[PDB]
Amino acid sequence: LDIPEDYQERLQAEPFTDCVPMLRLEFTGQSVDAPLLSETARRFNVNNNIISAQMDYAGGVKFGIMLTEMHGTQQDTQAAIAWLQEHHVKVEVLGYVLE
Amino acid sequence: LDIPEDYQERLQAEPFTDCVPMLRLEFTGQSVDAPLLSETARRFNVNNNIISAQMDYAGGVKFGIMLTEMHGTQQDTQAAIAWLQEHHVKVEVLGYVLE
Known part of the structure; x- marks a missing residue:
């Protein structure tokens, strides 16, 4: 896993209403000149x-x-997840946690 | 300076018209539950x-x-800088860059 044990413990594979995805994001050579997380927050x-x-x-x-x-x-x-990927930020949903 | 050499090269101590602050943020126990950077992006x-x-x-x-x-x-x-400080994120303006 090499996520924190706290998350190993609460992570659930299956979605469930008002779950929240835990993501692993991987940057692969973007310029700092692309404000990708700040743009997703507004957009x-x-x-x-x-x-x-x-x-x-x-x-x-x-x-x-x-x-x-x-x-x-x-x-x-x-x-937001799809738009991140469309900018070649790799995104993995590791599972879902509460709220 | 202890930042990447290209930033050290570009860094100006004096704020100029349309400059960009280069920040160092130091996290010292903020909860994962506080969406500090996302909120500043919108706010x-x-x-x-x-x-x-x-x-x-x-x-x-x-x-x-x-x-x-x-x-x-x-x-x-x-x-945004004043609000991060108000919310106890240690922020340091290292200097200013174009553009």
Whole structure:
């Protein structure tokens, strides 16, 4: 897993009403000049709650990992995840937690 | 300075018209439940562009550092920075960059 044991413990594979997805985000070389999480917060009215991160600035660009929760309506959440991927941020929904 | 060499090179101590603050954020036990950066994006119409981050999760809360640029109008970035400080995120303006 190499997520925190607290999350190993509460994570549920199956969605459930007003669950919240726990995400693993992977940056693969974006410029810092792309404000992707700040844009999703306004555009999709979601909150991206950072759990942890190992984000490296290497070669003048961004390569690394973040664990987050994404809070918002189900439609907004799905749209934000897809838009992140459409900008080549890899996104894995690791499972779902409460609220 | 202890930031990436290209930022060290570009960093100005004096604020200039349309400059961009380069921030260091230090997390010292903020809960994962507080959507600090997402809320500033909406509240103050700024972008928090992550440069790098080494953030750990422990006991339900967060510890570590992030380097960012903050983009927005002068009054908006001033208000977002003041609000993060008001909410006890340790913020340091390392200097200013184009553009």
